[model samples]
Target: FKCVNSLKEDHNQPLFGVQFNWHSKEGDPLVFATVGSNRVTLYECHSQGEIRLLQSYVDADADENFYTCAWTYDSNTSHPLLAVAGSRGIIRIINPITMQCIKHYVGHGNAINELKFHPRDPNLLLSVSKDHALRLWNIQTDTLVAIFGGVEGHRDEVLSADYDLLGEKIMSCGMDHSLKLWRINSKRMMNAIKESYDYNPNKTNRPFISQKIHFPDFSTRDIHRNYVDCVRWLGDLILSKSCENAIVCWKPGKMEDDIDKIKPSESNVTILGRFDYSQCDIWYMRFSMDFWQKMLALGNQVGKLYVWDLECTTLTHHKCGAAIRQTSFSRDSSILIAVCDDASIWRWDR
Candidate 1:
């Protein structure tokens, strides 16, 4: 229910990727990756709002190249692993505790923007780059699983992607201005699920595509605008952001036969709820793990964080400065982590 700590990088470099450990033995510690300074740091948090620095890494530093990162926790092994995406399309997998480069998985031709460990599988990871391709990686074997690219008409840089709560599907959004759903196949490849859009080029003049991704079949509301910024999928609802400074919740429906032939049908998705903040651009959003509590959190371009009650549509906003890049909630939803352009990490708790 308060701001616990505001951790700043020692060298004043921007921190990009932040995540809470999924399998922490000691009170769910948090780990973060910094881009400008090229390092990974781990912290153990106590209930009393104190954080202890457990580990730090700087050996795998690539000058001006570290961009995004993810951590893989193996219960089989005593320690966790870190996978980081460099600015030059190189993924460095390291042991954070030892600060050693365990493996380097390379594939992309451009800067990697996002890297994630598979929700259900510890051995699998997913990455998207500015090169407009999504690649799946096998951490154990250090091999690339499959390559999924954007559709021909929408092959723009993928900004973000996430697996659903059930892990049955993955959703992605990009500068191409559309949200796409992909069904996870047995080979770790993906099949097209469904695509939804709020804007019509034939009807409107918004040139750039909005960046957002979510499963609409679970929600009951529409996206605020044609240009989306980010998306998060809950059990039966989708949290989405648009350029119009609004967060929308959508309920997705099944795709009917001949649905592809008919373009822009309202029956494709439903609107459940919505919240608006004037003059604010929400770039990312996340929800608490508990489904019964309809609490939603989002980060805006102006470095402000907002927490909302989805059921009552009540909102609480917090102002942090310098364009917030990404924000995420802990596995148990007890802590909220916000990263900003000011090269600082902010934590909030309830």
Candidate 2:
């Protein structure tokens, strides 16, 4: 992989997250979003390796710092939607074409570390926050479907969390030096259920209050010595990275009957392989896999981009000028984009 283009404009502040649009319209130029200090900008990557800034939506509050961004769709019109959140603890759903804020979700009390839309449901969202909690929201009805952390949850800030391919499971890691796996219950138990409750058929379509906190099926604090900032689902296995100078590929072992049981040993965590020679020791730096899940790439503190071929088990790296905070691949896997600490956008074309 070779760097084809680099753009440094008004983005002088560090950028944390970048994502390509998976639901792009036919015959339209591929687009992506980068979120950071009080701003989220949309860019179009032309087929010929030219990247142009399309629109940038800046927050009115200068203190609002943006951390993560994700792509989704409007269920009715099939129009693309951008989900963005950060230190403000509020999420804004923006229409990429019109560049307008369509909705704002206000639930998380502390800064939100990341945001992810449900794999199957366009209107569903999952958010992880520094408040040591993960939340599920139904954007269509503006309702909090469930909360997934409590006394048994992460003891410190929760950095990242992701829904598995089936959307029935969740894998999360954080500053607490732990990795957790949660199972979503098919039956919805409302907060009102804790109290004497009665329901009327025509009164409401959904619950009036948030669901109770959920405990993980499996939890382990021995995976990484420091913060486990980024994690993803590679099929049924888990791929995670901390400041340990390598990315660990592992999976959970057999579970016990107690939901709150924490495994004291790394014996419960199966190690499959490791991606070494990495220089990233900072928090919030993320990795990416192509839409086909064939190629994985991540950046380092020294401005190096690491690419791995899962099929061939080969590795390659590209050098830049500063730390690469995050990497993203276009839906077609034709281009790779990395956001850096120097406020520059680096692009590589296949």
Candidate 3:
């Protein structure tokens, strides 16, 4: 892996969300959303680590607000749509090529933390917010199809939400220290489970409830000692990053029973995938799409990025001089995009 380019903002504005284009006709384009400057910037990436600004979108009438972004391609119309979650609890769908706001869906009540498009259905999009709600919208009609939230849903800020590979079930984890599963077609929460252990049973704690839905019996593997910052499901495996300087992997169905039986061992729970920046806690992590690659990418509090190849057990680290918030992999698994708290964007080639 190598750093292709480090893109900085015009002045001191911090950039936040950075994503690679999924519908570019030419070479892949990079789309970024800024928090401080409140603008959407697009760039065309070239072979020799060079980029040219293609467009910059700033809506004067709307408040400068955005958190995460997602891109989808409409095969029927042969067009690409960009969805951005703003601070006003609204989603702005724009045409990246024309830099025009196509539609704005006002649904969320708080800051939208993350947004993702369905892998198979381009018209469907999923968004989670600090309001503790998960919303599904139809892009064609700009109407909310289903809204899943209640006492069983996320109680605090929902940090990250993602759909399984099959897009049948959705998983969300947040500040409440809980992970929830929602069945889309059934329009109900399938299960609500808390991973953290609270030793004090007399603290008036609720036993993480699930309403009207049955969940497969699974055991919780207590590994992290602190907050789970990020989580994603890859096929049969679940990967999570915590504030405790650890990267964890779990096999959902098969290993739960065995994991529950075994006593918690520090040596076994902590894999020590990368320790170059031990003082800095990890905040985000992701795996490549191809299973055989066995590679993991992570971002940390100090803006340090690390890539570990599980097959070779080798590590590579890069420092971006700001706290790195999130990292995403391209569809082809060849490019890596990182977003930092300082609003700087970095791209790496693998």
Q: Total clashing residue pairs per candidate? A: 22, 0, 2
Between candidates 1 and 3, the TM-score winner = 3
- lDDT of the candidates, in the order given: 0.60, 0.80, 0.60
Cα misplacement distance, residue 241 of candidate 2 (Å): 0.8
Q: Which ranges in model 1 have alpha carbons more than 4 Å from their true place?
A: 26-37, 59-62, 150-153, 186-229, 251-267, 282-294, 310-319
TM-score of each model, in listed order: 0.74, 0.89, 0.75
Give per-residue CA lDDT, model 3, range 120-192, as digits (tens).
6787788888887777776764446566676456667777777777676676666666555555534242111
The TM-score-based order of candidates, best leading, equals 2, 3, 1
Candidate 1 C-alpha lDDT tens digits along 1-350: 47878777676776666666555554445554434456777776667667677767774444745656677776477477778775778888877777678878777888777787776777778787778777766666455555666343236676666777656665666666666555564332332111112323466565422222222222112344344446567664556666676766665554342312323333466566677665464443322223344566656565667677555222233546655565666666677777766677777777
For every candidate structure, what is the RMSD over all alpha carbons to the true structure, in angstroms?
Answer: 10.3, 4.3, 9.8
Name the top TM-score candidate: 2
TM-score of 3: 0.75
Name the 10 consecutive residues with the lowest summed lDDT in model 1. Answer: 190-199
Which regions in candidate 2 have their CA more than 4 angstroms from the true location?
A: 189-207, 254-267, 312-319
lDDT of 2 at 274: 90
